[PDB]
Nucleic acid binder design. Structure first.
Length: 1209
RNA sequence: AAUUUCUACUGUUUGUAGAUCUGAUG
C-alpha cells in the first residue's frame, strides 16, 4: 500500500523482438523475387561503401587542414615552459587548461562560421552524399574515385541511393572527430594535446644549441641532412603548422624515425664513441572482425612474432637499468600498487611507506580540517625509483626494491622470455577453418600471448604521462618509441580472446528492406502504401502482413463479411501535438479563415511558455478555440473522437496539449474475410508472417513471457478506453542465415536416457522425440523488432520532483520495513529485512533461490554448487582460455534471477531496498561477486523497477500490466547513481561488516607493531589490564581519548575480555606453508608468555608491568593476541563455518557469539554485513520521519554519526 | 539439453522459471 499511487507516472519506451514464421506459400515467393539475396549483397557492399566514405573523411581532413592559421604558439611556448610548477599545480594549470581550450577552438574554427568550408559541410549529413544534382563528385572524391568509370567502384555505390539512411548510425561516430570538446576521440585533441606537447618537447631537446656543448657538432648534422630531410622543418617553433596535415607528420617522422635519420646520426657521431644525448620521439598520426581461422593464424604468424615486434629492445635497455639515474626515472601514482604487488611485497606496502614518510610534516591540532586534504593528493607520488624507505624503526626490513626492473629480464631468460621455447610448434598450413577444441596444441599459443601482456605490464609501471622537467631523457627518449609500440598488445590479445572463445553459432543478421527504403517507418495509415506493412489477427495469434510493389490496392475494396475473418488494424495517429499543431498554423488561407493580426502576433512574441513572461487568460482563450475549430475543418485530423474540455475549465496550454496526447492515438480493428486473404498469398500478391515467440506455441502451458505480455496488451479491448501502451513506428525485419549444421552439434536421439545436471534432482526422462542442440541456429529464420511505448499520454518527468513523491509517501505511510543487500565472502549475496524498531524479520542467503513455480511445484537450484563446479572448470591449466567467460556469463545471468527475488520482497513487506554506494564504499576485500559485475546488478535493479509488473497477479491488483509500478527514477541518467533512486537508497559500505551487532563495537584502534620505543607508550594508554580469577578471562580496558584516531561518538570506554575459541583468520609464512588457518586459543595463550617471560599477573593492575619488559617477543606477541581479539569476524578452513565473536559484553553481561545462538540476530558473518547495511537505511528512514521540510534534506552518512547511532539504539 | 535473445535447466510426449535492451570498433 506504500506503492499504491506509484502507477502511471512517466513514459518509457522499449523494443519487443519476435520471430516471423512464413505462413502459407510465401517463403517460396520471397525466394522467387530474391529479396534475401538482394539485402545480403547490399549488407555485403555496406562495408565497402563505409571504407570509401572513410577515405572521403581522410581526404576531407587533409583538405581542411592547412587553413587554420593558429597564432598562439609563442604564447604557448612562454606559458607551457617550464612545465608549469608541479608542486604548485593549482591556479596555473587551470590557465594552461584555458590556453589549451582557446588553442583547440581554432582547429574547429575554420569550418564553422568561416565559410571557406561552409559550416553545414554539405556531406557529413548523409542525405545528399548520394543522388544530389544527379552527381556531386565533381568537387568531391569522385574525381579520384572515377578511374574512368572504375569497375569495382561506382557499381558498389549504385545501391545506396534510395537507402541513404543506413549511415545514420555511422555518421554519429564520424561527427565526433570534428568536435570542439576535449574528449580524446577528436581531431583537435590529437593535434593540440597529443602532438603539440610532444613537438615542444622534441624541439627543446634539439634547441639546446649553446646550453650544452652542442655548439660545435650541430652543423655536421645539418650538412649531412642538407642532401635530404631538412632539419629546418623540425628546429623552429613557427614551423609547426607545416605538419598539421597527415602528409606533414609523416615527413616529420621520416626525419625522427629515419631511413638515414637524425636519431641515428646523433647516436653514431656523439653516443657510440660519460654523457649521452637523448633521442627524439615521433609524433602521432591523426585518424575488426577476425572471423576466419586463416586470418588469426596468419596474424599471429607475423604481426606479433619476431619479424614485427621486437622484445630485444626492452632486453638490452632494461639490462642496463642501473646505469641511468634513478632520480630521473618516474613512477605515476596509478601504478604504485601494481608495482608493489608484482615485486617488493604486498598490495599496500608502498601506500604505507609513502604516507609513512610524508605525514611527519603535518600535525592535526584543531580538527574544517584543511590540512589532511592538501597533504594527501599532492605528496603521495614520490615519482622516483624509491629508496625503499629508511625504516630505521624496524618496519619489516628487507632488500632493495630498485634492482627489480634490472632483474625481471635477468630472471633466467629462458623462463621469463618464453617466446624462445614457444617458437618450435609453428607453421601456416593450408587451412580454411577449424573448430576450437578444449585442449589442442593451441594452449601454448594463448600462453605465448599470456607472457605478452605481462611484458606490457612490466613497462606499464613507468606510464608517466609527463610533462615533467628533470626526468631522465636518456631513458625516456628510447622508451617513448618503445612503449607506444608495446602498448598495442592489449588490443591484439583482446581480439584473440574474442575469436578463440567463440560460440559454435553466429549472430550476424542483415536488415531486410524488401526493396522499400521507408519499410515499416510508420504503421497502418493513409501512408500504408509507402510503408507496406499491416497487422492481422486470427483470434489466437497476431500476423504481420507485408504488401507488394505490384499490388498495393488490395485493402481498399476488401470483403468485410464472413465467418472466421482476419481483423485489420487502423492506427490513425497525430505525432507531436505541441509540434504538429504549429505545422497547420502556417497557412495563407487554407486553415486561416480567421487570421487576426492580434492573435498571430501574440503567438510569435508571446507563444513560448504560454506568454512572453505573463500568464493571461485572453490570448490563451483565443489560441485554443482557433485550434479547436481548426481541427474540425481539415479532413486529416477530422473523424477523430476528440472529446475536448471547454476553454473555461483549463487555461494552461500544457493542459491542452496533455488532453490531445491520448486522444491523438487511435487504434481500431475492422475485419476482412479470410478466404480472400488466403487465396492471394498463394498467388504472391501479399506476404503473410506470424509474429511468434515460444509462448504462442500450441503445446505451451506455463506462464507467458514478459515481453509477450506487453505485445498482447497492445491490442486488448481495454485499449479502446484510454491507452497505456503504444505501438511505435520505425520497426525492422532482420534475417539470420543458417550458421550451424545438424551433425555438428551433439544431439540426444530417440529413446536415449538423460541425467539431470542439478545435484538435487535424481530422476531421468525418456524423451521419445529427438532433441537437437541449438535448434534455433540450425535453420535460418526471420526476426521482427517491434518498438513499444508505455504510459503514453502522461506528461510527468524525472528527478525535477527531487524525489518529493517518494519521500512524502514514506512519511504518510506507517511502519515501513527496510531491506539491506550486501555482498558476501562465503555467500554469493545475502539479504536481511529490518523493521522500524531494528529487529530482523527474515534473513536468508541467495545461494539457494526458489521462485521456480511451474504449476505449484517449487524447484530450488543451488547456485553455490554450480560456482564450485565452475571454479574447478577454470582450474584446468591445459585447457582453453574461454572458461573464464562462462562464469561471467553465469553471474550476468544469476543476477537476473536475484532482481526478481528483491522485487517480490519489496511487495511483501512494503519495504525499502538499501544497497551499498559504489562511489565511496567501493574499497572492499575479496568477494565471490566482483565490483564491475555488481554495478550491472545495481543498474538492472533500476531498470526493472522503472516498469515493474507481476506476471501471476490479476489485472485488478496494483502491480499487473494494467497498473505497472514506477518505483525508481528513469534511466536516462544512467551514470549518476547517488544516494537515492526512488525507493532505492545508497549507503557507504565502510564500517558495516565487522561490528558487534549487540553493543555496536568496532575496533577503532589498530594494534600493529612498528617500533618498540613507542610500543611502551601504546600499552601505557590502557586504563587497566588485569586478570579475573573468578570470571576466567583477561581485561583490556581502553579509552579512545588517550589513543589516536579520535572518535566523537559515545562509548569511549570499553572492556575487551577473552573467550573459549577464536578460529583465527588466514595468516601464513613460507615455513608456515600449510592449510594456513591456525586457530588460536587466546585465554590460555595469555596465560602463556607471562609465566614464560617471568612477569607475574596476579597483581591488579599490571599495565605498567608490561612496559618494563623489552624482550622484543613479548611486545610483539601481545600485538598478535590483541589483533586476534579486536578482529571481530572469524573464518576457518571448514567452509560452512564462518562467524563473529565479540570481546565486549552487553549491559546484561553475556557475549555475542553468532553461532550460539540465533534468536532474531545475524546468523553468521555474512548476515552481519547485510544487517548493518539495513541499519544504515533505518537511519535514512529516521531522517525522513524527523523532516518537517523535505525539500533539501541531505541523506549523507558521516562516519561518526553512524557509530553514534548504532550503539545508542 | 529444445528459447526473439541471455541464464539455469528438464521444469506434462516438440517444453519450465526468471530476465531482455536496442542500434553498432578499444
Amino acid at each position: 500500500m506504500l506503492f499504491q499511487d506509484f502507477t502511471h507516472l512517466y513514459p518509457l519506451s522499449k523494443t519487443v523482438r519476435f520471430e516471423l514464421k512464413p505462413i502459407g506459400k510465401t517463403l517460396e515467393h520471397i525466394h522467387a523475387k530474391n529479396f534475401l539475396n538482394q539485402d545480403e549483397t547490399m549488407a555485403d557492399m555496406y562495408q565497402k561503401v563505409k571504407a570509401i566514405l572513410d577515405d572521403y573523411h581522410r581526404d576531407f581532413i587533409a583538405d581542411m587542414m592547412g587553413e587554420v592559421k593558429l597564432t598562439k604558439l609563442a604564447e604557448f611556448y612562454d606559458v607551457y615552459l617550464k612545465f608549469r610548477k608541479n608542486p604548485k599545480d593549482d591556479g596555473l594549470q587551470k590557465q594552461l587548461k584555458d590556453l589549451q581550450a582557446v588553442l583547440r577552438k581554432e582547429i574547429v574554427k575554420p569550418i564553422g562560421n568561416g565559410g571557406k568550408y561552409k559550416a553545414g559541410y554539405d556531406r557529413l549529413f548523409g542525405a545528399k552524399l548520394f543522388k544530389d544534382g544527379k552527381e556531386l563528385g565533381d568537387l568531391a572524391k569522385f574525381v579520384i574515385a572515377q578511374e574512368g568509370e572504375s569497375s569495382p567502384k561506382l557499381a558498389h555505390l549504385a545501391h545506396f541511393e534510395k537507402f541513404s539512411t543506413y549511415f545514420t548510425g555511422f555518421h554519429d561516430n564520424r561527427k565526433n572527430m570534428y568536435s570542439d570538446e576535449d574528449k580524446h576521440t577528436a581531431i583537435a585533441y590529437r593535434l593540440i594535446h597529443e602532438n603539440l606537447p610532444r613537438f615542444i618537447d622534441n624541439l627543446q631537446i634539439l634547441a639546446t644549441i649553446k646550453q650544452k656543448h652542442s655548439a660545435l657538432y650541430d652543423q655536421i648534422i645539418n650538412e649531412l641532412t642538407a642532401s635530404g630531410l631538412d632539419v629546418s622543418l623540425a628546429s623552429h617553433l613557427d614551423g609547426y603548422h607545416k605538419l598539421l596535415t597527415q602528409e606533414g607528420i609523416t615527413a616529420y617522422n621520416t626525419l625522427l624515425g629515419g631511413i638515414q635519420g637524425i636519431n641515428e646520426l646523433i647516436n653514431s657521431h656523439h653516443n657510440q664513441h660519460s654523457e649521452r644525448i637523448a633521442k627524439l620521439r615521433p609524433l602521432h598520426k591523426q585518424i575488426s572482425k577476425f572471423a576466419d581461422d586463416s586470418e588469426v593464424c596468419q596474424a599471429v604468424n607475423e604481426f606479433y612474432r619476431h619479424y614485427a615486434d621486437v622484445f630485444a629492445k626492452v632486453q638490452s635497455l632494461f639490462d642496463g637499468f642501473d646505469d641511468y639515474q634513478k632520480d630521473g626515472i618516474y613512477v605515476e601514482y596509478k601504478n604504485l600498487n601494481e608495482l608493489s604487488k608484482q615485486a617488493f611485497g604486498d598490495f599496500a606496502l608502498l601506500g604505507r611507506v609513502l604516507d609513512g614518510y610524508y605525514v611527519d610534516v603535518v600535525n592535526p591540532e584543531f580538527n574544517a580540517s584543511l590540512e589532511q586534504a592538501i597533504e594527501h593528493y599532492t605528496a603521495r607520488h614520490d615519482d622516483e625509483s624509491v629508496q625503499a624507505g629508511k625504516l630505521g624503526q624496524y618496519f619489516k626490513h628487507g632488500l632493495a626494491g630498485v634492482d627489480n626492473p634490472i632483474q625481471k629480464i635477468h630472471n633466467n631468460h629462458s623462463t621469463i622470455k618464453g617466446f624462445l621455447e614457444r617458437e618450435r610448434p609453428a607453421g601456416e598450413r593450408a587451412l580454411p577453418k577449424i573448430k576450437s577444441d578444449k585442449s589442442p596444441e593451441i594452449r601454448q599459443l594463448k600462453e605465448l600471448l599470456d607472457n605478452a601482456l605481462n611484458v606490457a605490464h612490466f613497462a606499464k609501471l613507468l606510464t608517466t604521462k609527463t610533462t615533467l622537467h628533470n626526468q631522465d631523457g636518456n631513458f625516456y627518449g628510447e622508451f617513448g618509441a618503445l612503449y607506444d609500440e608495446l602498448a598495442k598488445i592489449a588490443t591484439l590479445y583482446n581480439k584473440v580472446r574474442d575469436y578463440l572463445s567463440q560460440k559454435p553459432f553466429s549472430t550476424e543478421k542483415y536488415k531486410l528492406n524488401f526493396g522499400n527504403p521507408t519499410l515499416l517507418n510508420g504503421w497502418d495509415l493513409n501512408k500504408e502504401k509507402d510503408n507496406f506493412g499491416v497487422i492481422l489477427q486470427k483470434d489466437g495469434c497476431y500476423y504481420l502482413a507485408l504488401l507488394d510493389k505490384a499490388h498495393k490496392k488490395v485493402f481498399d475494396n476488401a470483403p468485410n463479411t464472413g465467418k472466421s475473418v482476419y481483423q485489420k488494424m487502423i492506427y490513425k495517429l497525430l505525432p507531436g501535438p505541441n509540434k504538429m499543431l504549429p505545422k497547420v498554423f502556417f497557412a495563407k488561407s487554407n486553415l486561416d479563415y480567421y487570421n487576426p493580426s492580434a492573435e498571430l502576433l501574440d503567438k510569435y512574441a508571446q507563444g513560448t511558455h504560454k506568454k512572453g513572461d505573463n500568464f493571461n487568460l485572453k490570448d490563451c482563450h483565443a489560441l485554443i478555440d482557433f485550434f479547436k475549430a481548426g481541427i474540425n475543418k481539415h479532413p486529416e485530423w477530422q473523424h477523430f473522437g476528440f472529446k475536448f474540455s471547454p476553454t473555461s475549465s483549463y487555461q494552461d496550454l500544457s493542459d491542452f496539449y496533455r488532453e490531445v496526447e491520448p486522444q491523438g492515438y487511435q487504434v481500431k480493428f475492422v475485419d476482412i474475410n479470410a478466404d480472400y486473404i488466403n487465396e492471394l498469398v498463394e498467388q504472391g500478391q501479399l506476404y503473410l508472417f506470424q509474429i511468434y515467440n515460444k509462448d504462442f506455441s500450441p503445446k505451451a502451458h506455463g506462464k507467458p513471457n514478459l515481453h509477450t505480455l506487453y505485445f498482447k496488451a497492445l491490442f486488448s479491448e481495454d485499449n479502446l478506453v484510454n491507452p497505456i501502451y503504444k505501438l511505435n513506428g520505425e520497426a525492422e525485419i532482420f534475417y539470420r542465415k543458417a550458421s550451424l549444421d545438424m551433425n555438428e552439434t551433439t544431439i540426444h536421439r530417440a529413446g536415449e536416457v538423460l541425467e539431470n545436471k542439478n545435484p538435487d534432482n535424481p530422476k531421468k526422462r525418456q524423451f521419445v522425440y529427438d532433441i537437437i542442440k541449438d535448434k534455433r541456429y540450425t535453420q535460418d529464420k526471420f526476426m521482427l523488432h517491434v518498438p513499444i511505448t508505455m504510459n503514453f499520454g502522461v506528461q510527468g518527468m524525472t528527478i525535477k520532483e527531487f524525489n518529493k513523491k517518494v519521500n512524502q509517501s514514506i512519511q504518510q505511510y506507517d511502519e515501513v520495513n527496510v531491506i539491506g543487500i550486501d555482498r558476501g565472502e562465503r555467500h554469493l549475496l545475502y539479504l536481511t529485512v529490518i523493521n522500524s524498531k531494528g529487529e530482523i524479520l527474515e534473513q536468508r542467503s541467495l545461494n539457494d533461490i526458489t521462485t521456480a513455480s511451474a504449476n505449484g511445484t517449487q524447484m530450488t537450484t543451488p547456485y553455490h554448487k554450480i560456482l564450485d563446479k565452475r571454479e574447478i572448470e577454470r582450474l584446468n591449466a591445459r585447457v582453453g582460455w574461454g572458461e573464464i567467460e562462462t562464469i561471467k556469463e553465469l553471474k550476468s545471468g544469476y543476477l537476473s534471477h536475484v532482481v526478481h527475488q528483491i522485487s517480490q520482497l519489496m511487495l511483501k513487506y512494503n519495504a525499502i531496498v538499501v544497497l551499498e554506494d559504489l562511489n565511496f564504499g567501493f574499497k572492499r576485500g575479496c568477494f565471490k561477486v566482483e565490483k564491475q559485475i555488481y554495478q550491472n546488478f545495481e543498474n538492472a535493479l533500476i531498470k526493472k523497477l522503472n516498469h515493474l509488473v507481476l506476471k501471476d497477479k490479476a489485472d485488478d491488483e496494483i502491480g499487473s500490466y494494467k497498473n505497472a509500478l514506477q518505483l525508481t527514477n528513469n534511466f536516462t541518467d544512467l551514470k549518476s547513481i547517488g544516494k537515492q533512486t526512488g525507493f532505492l537508497f545508497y549507503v557507504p559500505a565502510w564500517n558495516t561488516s565487522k561490528i558487534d551487532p549487540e553493543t555496536g563495537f568496532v575496533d577503532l584502534l589498530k594494534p600493529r607493531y612498528e617500533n618498540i620505543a613507542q610500543s611502551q607508550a601504546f600499552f601505557g594508554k590502557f586504563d587497566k589490564i588485569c586478570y579475573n580469577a573468578d570470571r576466567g578471562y583477561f581485561e583490556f580496558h581502553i579509552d579512545y581519548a588517550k589513543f589516536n584516531d579520535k572518535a566523537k561518538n559515545s562509548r569511549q570506554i570499553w572492556k575487551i575480555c577473552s573467550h573459549g575459541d577464536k578460529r583465527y583468520v588466514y595468516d601464513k609464512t613460507a615455513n608456515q606453508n600449510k592449510g594456513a588457518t591456525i586457530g588460536v586459543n587466546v585465554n590460555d595463550e595469555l596465560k602463556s608468555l607471562f609465566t614464560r617471560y617471568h612477569i607475574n599477573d596476579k597483581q591488579p593492575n599490571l599495565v605498567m608491568d608490561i612496559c618494563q619488559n623489552n624482550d622484543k617477543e613479548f611486545h610483539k606477541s601481545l600485538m598478535y593476541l590483541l589483533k586476534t581479539l579486536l578482529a571481530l569476524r572469524y573464518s576457518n578452513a571448514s567452509s560452512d563455518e564462518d562467524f563473529i565473536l565479540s570481546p565486549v559484553a552487553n549491559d546484561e553481561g553475556v557475549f555475542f557469539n553468532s553461532a550460539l545462538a540465533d534468536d532474531t540476530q545475524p546468523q553468521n558473518a555474512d548476515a552481519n554485513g547485510a544487517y548493518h547495511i539495513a541499519l544504515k537505511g533505518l537511519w535514512l528512514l529516521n531522517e525522513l520521519k524527523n523532516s518537517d521540510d523535505l525539500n533539501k534534506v541531505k541523506l549523507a552518512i558521516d562516519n561518526q554519526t553512524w557509530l553514534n547511532f548504532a550503539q545508542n539504539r
